[PDB]
Write a protein that holds these residues in place. Structure first.
Motif, PDB file in Angstrom:
ATOM      1  N   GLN A 180     -36.052 -21.023  31.691  1.00 25.28           N
ATOM      2  CA  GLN A 180     -36.552 -22.375  31.638  1.00 25.28           C
ATOM      3  C   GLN A 180     -37.640 -22.562  30.922  1.00 25.28           C
ATOM      4  OE1 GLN A 180     -33.800 -23.496  35.086  1.00 25.28           O
ATOM      5  NE2 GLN A 180     -32.963 -25.286  33.742  1.00 25.28           N
ATOM      6  N   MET A 199     -34.440 -34.658  31.844  1.00 29.51           N
ATOM      7  CA  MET A 199     -33.254 -33.766  32.151  1.00 29.51           C
ATOM      8  C   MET A 199     -32.293 -34.007  32.967  1.00 29.51           C
ATOM      9  SD  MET A 199     -33.628 -30.328  31.672  1.00 29.51           S
ATOM     10  CE  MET A 199     -35.244 -29.704  32.080  1.00 29.51           C
ATOM     11  N   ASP A 238     -29.289 -35.588  34.136  1.00 26.90           N
ATOM     12  CA  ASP A 238     -27.886 -36.691  33.367  1.00 26.90           C
ATOM     13  C   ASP A 238     -26.729 -37.352  34.878  1.00 26.90           C
ATOM     14  OD1 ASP A 238     -27.652 -34.922  31.195  1.00 26.90           O
ATOM     15  OD2 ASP A 238     -27.944 -33.821  32.695  1.00 26.90           O
ATOM     16  N   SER A 283     -35.083 -38.336  24.750  1.00 26.96           N
ATOM     17  CA  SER A 283     -34.285 -37.992  25.293  1.00 26.96           C
ATOM     18  C   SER A 283     -34.148 -36.005  25.456  1.00 26.96           C
ATOM     19  CB  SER A 283     -32.733 -38.061  24.643  1.00 26.96           C
ATOM     20  OG  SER A 283     -31.193 -36.943  23.908  1.00 26.96           O
ATOM     21  N   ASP A 321     -31.560 -33.539  26.517  1.00 28.01           N
ATOM     22  CA  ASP A 321     -31.195 -32.382  24.936  1.00 28.01           C
ATOM     23  C   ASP A 321     -31.027 -32.472  23.165  1.00 28.01           C
ATOM     24  OD1 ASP A 321     -28.515 -30.701  25.460  1.00 28.01           O
ATOM     25  OD2 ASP A 321     -28.739 -31.909  26.996  1.00 28.01           O
ATOM     26  N   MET A 359     -35.296 -31.194  22.520  1.00 35.56           N
ATOM     27  CA  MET A 359     -35.112 -29.144  22.544  1.00 35.56           C
ATOM     28  C   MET A 359     -34.880 -29.074  21.194  1.00 35.56           C
ATOM     29  SD  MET A 359     -36.767 -28.256  24.559  1.00 35.56           S
ATOM     30  CE  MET A 359     -36.112 -26.593  24.997  1.00 35.56           C
ATOM     31  N   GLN A 360     -33.373 -30.025  20.672  1.00 34.10           N
ATOM     32  CA  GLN A 360     -33.077 -29.319  19.102  1.00 34.10           C
ATOM     33  C   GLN A 360     -33.691 -29.620  18.389  1.00 34.10           C
ATOM     34  OE1 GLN A 360     -29.272 -30.872  17.300  1.00 34.10           O
ATOM     35  NE2 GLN A 360     -28.880 -30.661  19.759  1.00 34.10           N
TER      36      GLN A 360
END
Ligand SMILES: [Ca+2]
Ligand SMILES: [Ca+2]
Ligand SMILES: [Ca+2]
Lengths: 159, 70, 118
Positions: free
Chosen positions: A16, A85, A87, C108, C110, C113-114
């Motif tokens: 990571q 990060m 959720d 955000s 995710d 990173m995208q």
């Protein structure tokens, strides 16, 4: 200086930490400071369909600036990544029921006593450190007990 | 007893008589079973209500502190 | 020493997470007992019947008793429900007091990173 996110970073796998670095290294391409200025954050934000003002942007930097640099470095970026990060979904209602399981005497206060017994009930070999510690964070008043509200503040963001 | 009280008494006896008296020894046994069950279920709602009462007492108490310490 | 610093952050959370899991575990250990507690209490407050050798007079007696007990038990139940109802109202009030006493631009996970990585 104890935060729910500091532990987040620490548990980040080498796999990571490695990918976040390439993401960071690409993130500050073009930056002279080699760090995230509003210039950089606004670029990525725009890739995400948003056009924040220079203000709101720098404001997001502050949200994590620890050195008054007015920018973001890799370690500061790592924090930022675990904050957005999780959720993470627990309700004050769930915790309220758990509170009652700590208050063995039903006084409406998890005290130093019940905390140890409790912290003990869990398979972990507890040391006087963990005890000295856990009660410190929770004890917002340090009035020898842990009341409802701060118990919530206490378990805030816990798995 | 006051005429109002005998009347309560009588009409209560009359409820017993209207529900039970015409039954035969067999419908009888089944009635006893029906009443028994009703009691059981009522008795069960009571126990859930009693348990909840205790919990509310603690919740009301915790809310006491919370309001004290503020 | 800040004397708040003693152990890691990975540790603090290491336990907090465990605390909650024996509490949840204790929460249902209780709910489990509450069940047997109910059955056991019902068995006493509403003993099952034994109509086996009862004659007509004795049987008719029983039905009358049981008919009387349904009124009784139901009143008792009402009285406890009232105390509980009241309590829902007193709780609504106290809570409304503590409550009374004591746009954004965010990134955000995710999504970023995208964007950065390929
Ligand atoms: Ca910085
Ligand atoms: Ca206590
Ligand atoms: Ca306290």
């Amino acid at each position: 200086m104890d935060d729910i996110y500091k532990a987040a970073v620490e548990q980040l796998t080498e796999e990571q930490k490695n990918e976040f670095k390439a993401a960071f290294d690409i993130f500050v391409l073009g930056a002279e400071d080699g760090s995230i200025s509003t210039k950089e954050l606004g670029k990525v934000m725009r890739m995400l369909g948003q056009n924040p003002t220079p203000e709101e942007l720098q404001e997001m930097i502050d949200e994590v600036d620890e050195d008054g640099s007015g920018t973001v470095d890799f370690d500061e970026f790592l924090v930022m990544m675990v904050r957005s990060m999780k959720d993470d979904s627990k309700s004050e209602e769930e915790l309220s029921d758990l509170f009652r399981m700590f208050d063995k005497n039903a006084d409406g206060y998890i005290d130093l006593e019940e905390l140890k017994i409790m912290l003990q009930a869990t398979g972990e070999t507890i040391t006087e450190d963990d005890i000295e510690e856990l009660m410190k964070d929770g004890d917002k008043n340090n009035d020898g007990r842990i009341d409802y509200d701060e118990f919530l503040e206490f378990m805030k963001g816990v798995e | 007893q006051t005429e109002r009280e005998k009347k309560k008494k009588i009409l209560a006896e009359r409820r017993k008589v209207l529900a039970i008296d015409h039954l035969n020894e067999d419908q009888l046994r089944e009635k006893a079973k029906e009443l028994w069950q009703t009691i059981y279920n009522l008795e069960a709602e009571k126990f859930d209500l009693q348990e909840k009462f205790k919990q509310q007492k603690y919740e009301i108490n915790v809310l006491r502190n919370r309001i004290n310490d503020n | 020493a800040k004397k708040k610093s003693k152990i890691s952050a990975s540790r603090k959370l290491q336990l907090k997470t465990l605390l909650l899991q024996i509490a949840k575990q204790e929460l249902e250990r209780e709910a489990e007992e509450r069940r047997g507690e109910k059955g056991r209490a019902l068995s006493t407050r509403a003993q099952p019947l034994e109509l086996a050798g009862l004659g007509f007079a004795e049987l008719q007696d029983l039905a009358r008793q049981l008919h009387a007990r349904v009124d009784k038990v139901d009143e008792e139940r009402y009285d406890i429900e009232a105390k509980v109802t009241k309590n829902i109202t007193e709780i609504a009030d106290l809570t409304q007091k503590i409550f009374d006493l004591r746009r954004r631009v965010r990134i955000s996970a995710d999504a970023m990173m995208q964007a950065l990585l390929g």
